[PDB]
Amino acid sequence: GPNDFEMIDKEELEQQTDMKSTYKEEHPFEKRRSEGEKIRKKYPDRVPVIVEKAPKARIGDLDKKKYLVPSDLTVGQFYFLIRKRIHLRAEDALFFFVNNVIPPTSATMGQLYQEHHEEDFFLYIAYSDESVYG
Amino acid sequence: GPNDFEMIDKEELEQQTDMKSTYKEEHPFEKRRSEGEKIRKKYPDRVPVIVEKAPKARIGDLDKKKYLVPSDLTVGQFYFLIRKRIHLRAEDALFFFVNNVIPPTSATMGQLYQEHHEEDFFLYIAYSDESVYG
């Protein structure tokens, strides 16, 4: 409601410790929100995901950071598809982080997007060789 | 199924960074699980909550750690009632952390317990004067 009070709640301060994103640094919020809003409108069966390396990760690079992922793929299948894009062995460690936390491997990409997408309509994922974002 | 393979999942490694608890260090898991199962059976309308101070918190002490909380109380109301037990002013900073994260102030204690109780059936909350757990 335009004339209703907006509650400011302590948990918003979690954003003080959000994961680093060069993507966010290079692109202003309004352009990001524009593109993610347009792409969610255009591929509603898919979610847009920015996949970036964690600051101290010792792990092979990824060419593209922007992915349109079917919303019914699990996180585990996404591990496989990113691993295949990085060209990692099955044994090479690969960890995802959403809001600094390893997401459930059973979870769907659509459920992660619904719960953790940002106000620019993008889901941000960091990847590392280690199990702690750092 | 006992004869079925148990999935070992990457997100379990989140527990490597679990918040400190003097309670868990002083009481072995099996005694805690016994008490949390018995107390969940006796009080189905309530959730058992362990409230302990964060390692770096500069904040008044709590005489008791063990609380039986009605599961329909909000996080905001639980803030108020813990505030009343510490005897803090309204304007004195007080933050809760569940699994290192500030919970939603609108969430119910029962929901928080459902998503975040540990295998001893206790919900663990740390409190601090600062907005980041440390």
Numbering used by the authors:
A (entry chain B), B (entry chain A): 1 to 134
Lines from the paper:
The core of the AIM is composed of four amino-acid residues [W/F/Y]-X-X-[L/I/V]28. The first aromatic residue and the fourth aliphatic residue bind to two hydrophobic pockets in Atg8 (the W- and L-sites, respectively), and the main chain of the motif forms an intermolecular parallel β-sheet with a β-strand (β2) of Atg828. Nonetheless, deletion of the short helix from RTN3245–264 reduced the interactions with mAtg8s.
We also determined the crystal structures of GABARAP (a mammalian Atg8 homologue) bound to AIM (LIR)-containing sequences from the mammalian ER-phagy receptors FAM134B, SEC62, and RTN3 (FAM134B450–468, SEC62361–376, and RTN3245–264). Remarkably, all the AIM-containing regions of the three ER-phagy receptors are structurally similar to that of Atg40, consisting of the core AIM and its C-terminal short helix. The core AIM residues of SEC62 (F363 and I366) and RTN3 (F248 and I251) interacted with GABARAP in a similar manner. In addition, the interactions were also impaired by alanine substitution for R67 in GABARAP and R70 in LC3B.
